[PDB]
Amino acid sequence: MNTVPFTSAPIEVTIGIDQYSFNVKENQPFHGIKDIPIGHVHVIHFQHADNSSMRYGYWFDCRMGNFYIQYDPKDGLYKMMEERDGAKFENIVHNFKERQMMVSYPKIDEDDTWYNLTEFVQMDKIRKIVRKDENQFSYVDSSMTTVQENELSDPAHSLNYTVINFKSREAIRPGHEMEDFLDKSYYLNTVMLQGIFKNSSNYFGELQFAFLNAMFFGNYGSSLQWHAMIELICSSATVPKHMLDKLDEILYYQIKTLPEQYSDILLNERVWNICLYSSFQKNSLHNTEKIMENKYPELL
Amino acid sequence: GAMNSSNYAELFNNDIKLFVDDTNVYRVTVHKTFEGNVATKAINGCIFTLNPKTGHLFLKIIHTSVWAGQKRLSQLAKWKTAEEVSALVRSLPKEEQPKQIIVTRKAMLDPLEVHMLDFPNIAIRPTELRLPFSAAMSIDKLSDVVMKATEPQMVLFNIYDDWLDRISSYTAFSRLTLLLRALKTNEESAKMILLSDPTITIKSYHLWPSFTDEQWITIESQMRDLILTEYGRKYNV
Lengths: 300, 237
Fold this sequence. Notes:
The complex is a heterodimer. Chain A is an alpha+beta fold. In chain A, about 40% of the residues lie in helices and about 15% in strands. Chain A folds into two domains: about 1-145, Substrate Binding Domain Of DNAk, Chain A, domain 1; about 145-300, Alpha Horseshoe (Serine Threonine Protein Phosphatase 5, Tetratricopeptide repeat), CATH 1.25.40.550. In chain A, a hairpin with a 2-residue loop joins strand 2 and strand 3 (about 20-25). The longest helix of chain A has 18 residues, at about 200-215. Chain A is elongated and about 65 Å long. Chain B has two domains: about 10-165, Prp8 RNase H domain, palm region (Nucleotidyltransferase, domain 5), CATH 3.30.420.230; about 165-235, Up-down Bundle (Acyl-CoA Binding Protein), CATH 1.20.80.40. Chain B is built from six helices and eight strands; from the N terminus they run βββββαβαβαβααα. A six-stranded mixed sheet of chain B has the order 7-6-1-4-5-8, with helices on both faces. In chain B, strands 2-3 form a two-stranded antiparallel ribbon. In chain B, a hairpin with a 5-residue loop joins strand 2 and strand 3. Chain B is globular and about 50 Å long. The two termini of chain B are about 35 Å apart. The interface of A and B includes residues 167, 168, 169, 178 and 181 of A. Chain B: This is Pre-mRNA-splicing factor 8.
């Protein structure tokens, strides 16, 4: 079990850790989150009481270093940092626990939710989408745009998701125009899986990362990417059986975890109705289809 | 963006553009089988590709052989249309290729767009206008060359005959769409009007009769009257 301490909490803020969250008052003695399960990525995120715009946060993995939060009054936000002084860090962590100023990562032992949302997400891939290689953790916020969005302005702040576009030369082999547009199996399996992602686990990892960024920060371009990667699979006649079965599990937990009041901007009507009812794979998402119907029958 | 009544005069500027109509690409007759079931028999069809400024028509004849052993033919028809349009563009010298292609049916956008991927600077546009180009097979010489074809074939025409020697593109296109509108609403009356007088002939190299200016005025008035009559009959007004 690992710890992320906080120097202080100078401004009223709602702090999230993974799917959990806590209200912290201005200069309330809050000094960190403890008992964070080792073995997965995590995200700690923020929304100031005064600016319900700009939700922001940091992706990290405790194995990769000792990390902590400190409020910056010049830039006006909670920053993540790395402490390289091993002893100095255990020292701060132990004293804060002794003084019991830390919340406990509040996992129920029956709950595999976070594991199922993050099965294929790996820090090394996150840091290629959010390129800032002087930090081991990755900052994301509500307003950051994607590389594809930028083509249609500052690329240091870009989400470098893999660009998917159904009406592109990449997607369409000359002479197989109609075939490849109606049955994207080529684009999925040769171009994307074998070519760019190398395997399905990296593909699923980017899909899950995009969903979580859409969910925790309302990042609009991440929601577009998540939907694009779903549609590419469902619009392919030929998909490995292990990918279909896993996709159904992945999407089930994503739909299960989404806040009910956000289904309107986070869920693209066309993609979901096409995947569940029109696509080649209409019959391969039984769990995802049952929970979509019993929870958001209106969107369908 | 889409073509509507507002941006109508853009058709007659000096940017090369083509209308593509696919309504007569896949044509069938519907009949009963010996066992009483329904079957279709395809007949020869055509793609109607027209430069509205110059009158140049690129009539790509679609032979029944293209359908042989193929499924979901109405969907395939849209992709064969786009393949053939794309080939037409590739065949034209660079300075003759269009800057826009306007499809008369929105279902052609995605097929054409995919087939034009090699021409990113050619804009594929829909239209809100309700153009009558389906009645192109009511023009006797076009119907004849389509129905006689034994192989795929491109036939070129000027759909305006020599009108542009005397009138502007705008006026020519209004005349063309009025004649076709009439032919669509009531082919028999429309054709009666065009051909009543045996002393006005169709040149071997033309599609329409060699009316004088004054006679075109009377024709256009007769076609107008035909269209309004048919509207009252359709709707009881």
